[model samples]
Target: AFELPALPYAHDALASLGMSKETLEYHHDLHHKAYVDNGNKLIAGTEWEGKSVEEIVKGTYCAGAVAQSGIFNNASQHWNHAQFWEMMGPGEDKKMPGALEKALVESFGSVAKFKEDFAAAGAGQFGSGWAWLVKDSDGALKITKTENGVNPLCFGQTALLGCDVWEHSYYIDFRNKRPAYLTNFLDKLVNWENVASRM
Candidate 1:
């Protein structure tokens, strides 16, 4: 029922920022497509067939700190990648929107502090996971991490920005240096306006 969303820019657009053509080609064309294809197959004859990605993900989520049902994994990944792709793209004004910066400063003392925490959350993830900036039910902004395809939605929080810590996301670009990849993501890849719009 879902498909791999198109990149907002060409494969080469982010190459200059450390995410290379070969990396995007394999990651998007093969890896992400696998989730879409498998998600489609798994949902075809099930009750989730006509549901939105978010609905499917939220509806099928089970309480596991490690992994979940196959359909939940595939569908939740589809949702995460859909949001992540839109969160980063080619843009001349990559600075944090002033409003977002004000919020960040209020929440974390400084922009650098917010980024440091976000990067650390991603880098310290033991295995395949994601680090996120989320808005809680109480209207506070905070940083969080999830193992596998679990996301803020699973906890009723709104995801503003997130970075995949899965090796496939960084190995081609930064090898085993997950911290470096996280820095590159926050410093180079993020589209702050996109994140601000959600908040």
Candidate 2:
């Protein structure tokens, strides 16, 4: 089976939302395809056959800087972007749901505060990384950042949400204003229900 999920929304659906259609055209059709193809080639007929991209990422531990590391990088990256896209909508429903909202209000005072923290975390990430909302093993909420395709999933953290801070994610639409892009993405494009359900 193809590891990449079919795009949930049209490439242009997110147009002007800091995601240009042309960027998606190149990012999805070209960049994503190249990653998938390269990863597939690197793993084919190897001992890693049948392994999920996450599994390979967590288990490989190959010094984290191998010359042929595209297999791990691209596979992990593909998974991350897929989830990022799925968790986004028109951002109309930014509030958390069910017990989740209650949990946030209890822990963080209010959903608004949570958004502040998340936005700060998103902007705080250096470069080519991800900002995430995850539940640690004890079910405690944690705001985290990971460089490259590094995800908390590999360390037993239950991810509740994520956003890609990679330039490829928004450069064409917002140019160098990553913070603005992050803010717009969270305030106007997040699907809290989608992320909540996954939790």
Candidate 3:
């Protein structure tokens, strides 16, 4: 079984950022665990049993597969949630490192612009999905949106940072205000050190 990884912080760690303890409890303990459980269930008796999450995702992602297979959905969401937890933390010193700031500046002309583009991507995604800042195959940074459990892995990009746009991720705190959720994520929750390490 794909076990759920423990959260990187205490349940109340992000409360000051507007992501309450109850939110993490539901999002990580219940929702993320569901993905891990379902993913393990779908792959247990198949060839995918011993495969890595990345492998299962890539192998099952067909360009025109209508809806992706159950294995793909669960596995991809498992991988996505794993990264999601690692990308956020509560702290006073979460500033972007110099290298990451320079990279963002070069790619988007300014760090502020990069944030704007990322938030826009999140707000523009019509339904459940994720907003990502990724390193493309060419190593350039880009902001992208993926529908449902789809992520950068589907296209061979490296997800540096990703924010879940799914309602479950924000509805409790922000209600229907996804843009506010996104802004708070960027301004408060992001672990810039972790994001920079991906570069």
Best by lDDT: 3
TM-score of each: 0.96, 0.87, 0.98
Judged by lDDT against the true structure, how good is candidate 3? 0.93
In terms of lDDT, the poorest run of 10 residues in model 3 is 61-70
* lDDT by residue (tens digit), candidate 2, 46-109: 7777887778767664544523266667777767777887887643446767877877776678
lDDT score, residue 123, model 1?
78
**lDDT, candidate 2, residue 28?**
77
| CA RMSD of each candidate after superposition | 1.2, 2.4, 0.8
TM-score of 1: 0.96
Provide the lowest-lDDT 10-residue window in model 2.
Answer: 59-68
Give the TM-score ranking, best first: 3, 1, 2
Q: How many residue pairs clash in all the candidates, one count each?
A: 0, 0, 0
lDDT of each: 0.90, 0.75, 0.93
- What candidate 1 gets wrong by more than 4 Å, as runs, is 91-93
Q: What is the lDDT of residue 81 in candidate 3?
A: 93
lDDT of model 1 at residue 194? 91
